[PDB]
Design a binder for this molecule. Structure first.
Ligand code: 5DD
Ligand code: CL
Ligand code: MG
Length: 135
């Protein structure tokens, strides 16, 4: 199960916000979220399970950031983005998102692991500007 991954347990020891998705199910829904994640977003575990994590996006979320994630998952690439996300109550925060595939011995992606770090506006501002400049 989700907590049997050694890196999941590792992340738990620092109380990091993370989710696990199951890409073998249509639309790659979340199948575990840490307590940190549930508190950040304002949802109960049972509510988040079964949803694709795009439910944290909204009108001011940059579609180009979201497309970086989609492509990374498509192309088999680790991805890190900063993007605007939305809590259950509609209030927003900046989310630095770290995504990687968890693979079996043949390279088949068995789950995705996604770590979320809430970051300040100023940090998001500077990260995105550096991203854009470096690009
Ligand atoms: C989540 C974090 C997250 C973790 C993991 C493991 C996955 C697989 C996805 C996500 N989120 C992105 C979303 O699931 C989807 O991949 C993207 O929207 C890209 O595809 P679409 O163009 O939407 O079809 C998340 N997105 C968030 O905004 N916030 C999160 O916490
Ligand atoms: Cl997805
Ligand atoms: Mg559910």
């Amino acid at each position: 199960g989700a907590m049997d991954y050694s890196l999941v347990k590792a992340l738990q020891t620092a109380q990091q916000n993370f989710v696990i998705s199951d890409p073998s199910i249509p639309d790659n829904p979340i199948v575990y979220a840490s307590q940190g994640f549930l508190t950040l977003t304002g949802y109960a575990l049972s509510e988040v399970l079964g949803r694709n994590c795009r439910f944290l996006q909204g009108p001011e979320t940059d579609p180009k950031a979201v497309e970086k994630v989609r492509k990374g998952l498509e192309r088999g690439e680790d991805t890190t983005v900063v993007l605007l996300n939305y809590r259950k109550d509609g209030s927003t925060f900046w989310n630095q998102l770290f995504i990687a595939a968890l693979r079996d011995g043949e390279g088949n992606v068995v789950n995705y692991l996604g770590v979320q770090c809430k970051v300040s506006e100023d940090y998001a501002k500077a990260f995105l500007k550096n991203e854009e400049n470096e690009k």
